[PDB]
Amino acid sequence: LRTLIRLGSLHTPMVVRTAATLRLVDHILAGARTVKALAARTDTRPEALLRLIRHLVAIGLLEGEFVPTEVGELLADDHPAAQRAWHDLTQAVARADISFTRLPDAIRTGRPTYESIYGKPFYEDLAGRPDLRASFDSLLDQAFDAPAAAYDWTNVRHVLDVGGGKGGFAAAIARHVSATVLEMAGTVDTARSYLKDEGLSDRVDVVEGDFFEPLPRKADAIILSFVLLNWPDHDAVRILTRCAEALEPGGRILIHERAEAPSGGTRTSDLYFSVLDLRMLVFLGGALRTREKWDGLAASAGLVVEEVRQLPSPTIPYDLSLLVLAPA
Amino acid sequence: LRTLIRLGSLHTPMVVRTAATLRLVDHILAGARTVKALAARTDTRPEALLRLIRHLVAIGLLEEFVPTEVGELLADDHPAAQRAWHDLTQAVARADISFTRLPDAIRTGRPTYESIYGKPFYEDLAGRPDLRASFDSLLACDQDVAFDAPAAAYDWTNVRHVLDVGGGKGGFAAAIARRAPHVSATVLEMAGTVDTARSYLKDEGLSDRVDVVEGDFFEPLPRKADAIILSFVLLNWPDHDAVRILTRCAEALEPGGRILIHESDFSVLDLRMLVFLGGALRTREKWDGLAASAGLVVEEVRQLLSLLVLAPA
């Protein structure tokens, strides 16, 4: 009974997320240990903040003066795992997680619930909210060293990174190759700034546009890193087809995502990837795909999976893959 | 890191609550172990139900899928009633969505339920007979035994009549009537609830000893009594409202009468009161002040939870 109640408790994660959002652990580490000072710094009502703190003590994140535990220290804004931002309700991902309150609808329909809560589908909501666009892009350790090392660039003149975020993958590849990042409004500006500040602006450019439209140029390698999981099969096939049509002769499409058999691993990795797969369902109608589902998606786009390079890791983000696709 | 991610995960409790809402474990126990059959019984999309099942396996509620010993606690007939307490169509798990706006409650000290559902808690139940009934059944889910200890924490020898103010389905009045055959009692409750209290007390064979009045415990109470009961009532109310209720009870005491308040690290219950109702759990010193504002004094406290016995000051 205690196990079930713990698994089912909605209050504990919302208390953690509220503490992250209020930056409570940052304020304590900066010398606000008392409720009166912490209530001033967080702009909260002191009696209610103490009731929040009581739960944070009960679950082991805090211990009239309060300090973080070793686990609570991970909510410090400068901790390398960045768990404060990933739990911050004002930033894109924990905000999107509220969509899980309508999880029954998503299981009933297979369709995302984010629009029903926030008024627009995911990327269109970000397009109207520059703060959320920027926090989404910053949330997504630019992590691309191993996938860049898993491909032979000898015969590659130009790389097109489709949906390439702030440009970290293109940069890892750059470190004879030139590259282009294709991205959405807003994101293109932070990609350009990142690439300039890496000293790579003469090797990597950035184009604003829509990867459902004809791609801006041809390339020898076209990258889809954590893109296709955001889309249902029919959209994923459209993106793959745009990429296929943009390949130079002998070119390849590189997919950087999860591509395992549905077995193996541990309950810990099972859980971690269950969360990602369910986030794609609820936020976007997308999904993680097994190695076998990749074969079918590829065939619908006129492609074949030529090779799957394993990118192992026993710790988060665990084992990933680089799939290499060629025209069929 | 793993501990923090587990504590912070909204996904797992919503997967549990979705399984409870879909009555998934009941359908498995009733023969549907495969996704095709379970999708049909739950009226869900099979590929998405499988993704839900994968999470339920990873967290150890399921393991052709069958419930684990923990998952079996989501059977609808299990006496701890955890399926209904996690059911998003019933009152409490529905109210728990208020926690998605917990930062607002911490900022203001005010409930977030009305901002989500359009009306404050008891007004919403008053317009939704299904939610009113499921709330009453959730709290009364063990009322045949849960009031034996508070009833035995008080001596009924010189009590003639009991008034249970906000008495739910009547379980406390019934436990007192079984403890003390000489007492009569009255339950005061809201619309809807009074009908299921009347039915419960009739089916206990107590209808000649316990009656039920529909009314509002912020108004003059319907009669006087030697013992007036407030069981898990005052925690629903901010201080000024709790004082009003206590004062109405004080006005209705017979000479020599007493008010009985029936009310681990509880932070969940306290935060639920904040977000649902603006209420709170109270420590002893706070009870002393509330009592004093209503013209009362705390005469004795019995550990059971507690039973506080209040007398006119």
Ligand SMILES: CC[C@@]1(O)C[C@H](O[C@H]2C[C@H](N(C)C)[C@H](O)[C@H](C)O2)c2c(cc3c(c2O)C(=O)c2c(O)cccc2C3=O)[C@H]1C(=O)OC
């Ligand atoms: C923490 C691991 C990872 O960063 C992997 C994964 O993180 C990315 C970036 C990450 N970063 C260090 C650049 C790293 O390269 C990793 C291998 O890939 C990932 C994550 C999360 C999301 C997403 C992720 O791709 C999303 O794509 C995503 C999205 O496209 C739309 C909405 C939400 C999300 C995500 O929440 C993360 C994840 O799997 O969390 C369980």
Ligand SMILES: CC[C@@]1(O)C[C@H](O[C@H]2C[C@H](N(C)C)[C@H](O)[C@H](C)O2)c2c(cc3c(c2O)C(=O)c2c(O)cccc2C3=O)[C@H]1C(=O)OC
């Ligand atoms: C699970 C423990 C408990 O049943 C204690 C507590 O439940 C106890 C006492 C309760 N009572 C009728 C004696 C009953 O016997 C139940 C099975 O166990 C409790 C609970 C929950 C509520 C409430 C609780 O009292 C409420 O009163 C309540 C309310 O008045 C209005 C809105 C919501 C609620 C509640 O959600 C529960 C709780 O503390 O959850 C954290």
Ligand SMILES: C[S@+](CC[C@H](N)C(=O)[O-])C[C@H]1O[C@@H](n2cnc3c(N)ncnc32)[C@H](O)[C@@H]1O
């Ligand atoms: C940030 S995630 C993956 C980013 C990056 N490739 C990585 O691995 O971290 C998916 C990206 O697809 C982009 N995107 C979504 N729809 C798009 C579209 N129609 N055209 C171009 N980019 C799009 C989003 O802006 C987002 O940055």
Ligand SMILES: C[S@+](CC[C@H](N)C(=O)[O-])C[C@H]1O[C@@H](n2cnc3c(N)ncnc32)[C@H](O)[C@@H]1O
């Ligand atoms: C169910 S909880 C506690 C019930 C019961 N005494 C117990 O211990 O389980 C609080 C009760 O207060 C009742 N209540 C709320 N506002 C009321 C009001 N103004 N007048 C009478 N009853 C009210 C609700 O209907 C609800 O049943």
